[PDB]
Design a protein around this ligand. Sequence first.
Ligand SMILES: Nc1nc2c(ncn2[C@@H]2O[C@H](COP(=O)(O)OP(=O)(O)OP(O)(O)=S)[C@@H](O)[C@H]2O)c(=O)[nH]1
Ligand SMILES: [Mg+2]
Length: 310
Amino acid sequence: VKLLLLGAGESGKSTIVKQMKIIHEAGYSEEECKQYKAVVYSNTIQSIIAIIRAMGRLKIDFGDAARADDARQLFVLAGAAEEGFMTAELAGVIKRLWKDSGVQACFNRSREYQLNDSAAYYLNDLDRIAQPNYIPTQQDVLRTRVKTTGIVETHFTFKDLHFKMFDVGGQRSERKKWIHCFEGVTAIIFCVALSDYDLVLAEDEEMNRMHESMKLFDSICNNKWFTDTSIILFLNKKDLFEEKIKKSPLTICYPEYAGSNTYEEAAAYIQCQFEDLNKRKDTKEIYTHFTCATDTKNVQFVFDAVTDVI
Ligand SMILES: Nc1nc2c(ncn2[C@@H]2O[C@H](COP(=O)(O)OP(=O)(O)OP(O)(O)=S)[C@@H](O)[C@H]2O)c(=O)[nH]1
Ligand SMILES: [Mg+2]
């Protein structure tokens, strides 16, 4: 069984790859987790820095002036974290910045700039991750963000089927590499981030992230080459979408949306927007699933269902 994961940047493709290891193997060992220790620290430092940088551009002041000295110290000390080291002093500087009301106000305007989805997850768990002898947990590993370059190949056995899963980067510069994986594909798992509806591309701030996804799906779904390949659509980040729909209108993305700001109605509308792109509706089926890629139990059951479709 050859599976190819496609979708735009940060859609959740690489997270599904990590779940196969947790679910079908025995998860990440102590040595493997320790390798991710530097990614966690790097992800954390980059998140707080992205917020402090945006405050300048949007002209947002710190709630407490003293935070200005902490911001200074942050940069002086940031270098260590990059190397996989976190000093109690650095942890203290960041925790005080994160709690600042001005920092939080900017945090709440994250769609106006580019910020990692896992920023709050790590920043809120600073006491735990700044510990001496900290070893990333399986969830910390699943929460890391590293842009995929090249082609990753993973193998695993499930239900007496040997799987070969392929993963590639979704950002514009990596899409030219997709053609290298087009041979003998059994099924495509196309990932879409539901929470992308009010965000713009990191590669271009004039292009809405969800509209870019639609263009890609239309392109893949209707490619003659994939006529006999099963298309599985994963409408991902349902956890983030659930919290965002309450405070951010979907009309930002689909002006014609006339439903309420509820999860079930908004989610079903997006599903139809993607399913409608399929031009062979009578002769080509699309299998849609709503997922939370970081939730192992969710992914376990969805994959069960998917493999039966396989
Ligand atoms: N909260 C939440 N975060 C998720 C979910 N799926 C993915 N993430 C987070 O989103 C970030 C990006 O996901 P990732 O898997 O790296 O995307 P990608 O599609 O492989 O992106 P690329 O390699 O094309 S640039 C990661 O930090 C990951 O933990 C989800 O359903 N919920
Ligand atoms: Mg990736």
